[PDB]
């Protein structure tokens with residue numbers, strides 16, 4: 315905070331996603347329902363793109379579900395990760411890579427604004 | 428019904444998604460499992476595009492999960508929202524914006540049909 | 541196994557997704573949490589693309605949730621489907637089409653690798 319999306323890294327050259335870490339240590343239980351985890355990373359996005367926050371498979375398989383989230387092109391707030399412990403108690407350590415940001419083209423349409 | 432996708436609106440110019448509302452008042456509980464909510468909006472999509480139905484974050488955080496759904500380019504039926512109450516009883520009022528439609532390019536491949 | 545993505549089929553010409561079947565008979569219950577189902581299909585993907593594994597709506601409505609999964613362009617392993625029974629006992633028969641692979645453009649960015 316406030317760090318822009320350009321400070322994010324890719325695991326490897328062919329990785330679709332930019333890694334997102336939580337800035338806090340947080341414990342999640344199933345009965346808590348959706349929680350919004352801070353990343354300290356902020357919009358906006360490159361021109362003509364929008365973003366999608368998705369889970370990392372290794373984290374999904376460990377029982378933390380990330381709800382897919384749309385990041386609008388002109389969002390200037392903090393990108394947060396919407397997450398829920400599926401079945402068990404999940405512990406997120408500070409700096410753990412818990413989600414990924416995918417960049418996608420933003421298609422123009424004549425839809426009324 | 429039957430309204431085409433062109434009647435949908437964007438919240439703002441840089442919003443990735445087109446808002447989708449339910450045409451009915453519906454109550455959802457966790458034990459009901461996935462439910463398909465009517466929108467009165469119909470395919471098909473613009474040429475060379477397909478659609479993805481995603482949650483709105485403000486609705487996800489209130490405990491209604493929208494399952495990501497693929498809308499095929501040539502689908503001519505009613506676009507429905509697949510939704511589940513996560514932990515608590517959720518009440519959807521008629522006209523509440525509960526999901527969003529994202530348009531994405533449809534890539535051609537040589538895969539057999 | 542090992543079959544490449546090019547052996548996948550589309551249901552119809554305008555279908556966004558390539559169908560993915562499980563190679564095993566598997567029973568899933570809610571208390572099992574996320575499970576990774578084998579497909580016998582392998583990366584990598586076409587140049588400048590990445591993949592997203594999504595649910596088929598007819599399967600989602602029957603109570604099997606597929607967690608959206610990112611397939612990296614240069615992944616050479618087996619594409620697995622991350623799935624969870626929502627509320628009830630779900631039985632997957634061998635050869636049942638349980639998910640779909642969507643191909644999307646991979647946008648270049650200056651993000652550090």
Ligand SMILES: O=c1ccn([C@H]2C[C@H](O)[C@@H](COP(=O)(O)O)O2)c(=O)[nH]1
Nearest residue numbers: 367383384385386389393394483484
């Ligand atoms: O997982 C998410 C989803 C949304 N947002 C922020 C960016 C979006 O532009 C904004 C509004 O959300 P939606 O209406 O696009 O869902 O909230 C996030 O930080 N994380």
Ligand SMILES: O=c1ccn([C@H]2C[C@H](O)[C@@H](COP(=O)(O)O)O2)c(=O)[nH]1
Nearest residue numbers: 480496497498499502506507596597
């Ligand atoms: O959330 C969804 C997902 C699918 N469909 C419709 C449009 C799709 O073209 C069709 C078949 O679904 P899939 O096989 O693409 O998942 O069902 C919806 O109305 N809502």
Ligand SMILES: O=c1ccn([C@H]2C[C@H](O)[C@@H](COP(=O)(O)O)O2)c(=O)[nH]1
Nearest residue numbers: 370371593609610611612615619620
């Ligand atoms: O549903 C999924 C998600 C991921 N993967 C494989 C391909 C990805 O390239 C790799 C690493 O996963 P992620 O870090 O991209 O989530 O695991 C799958 O087989 N199925």
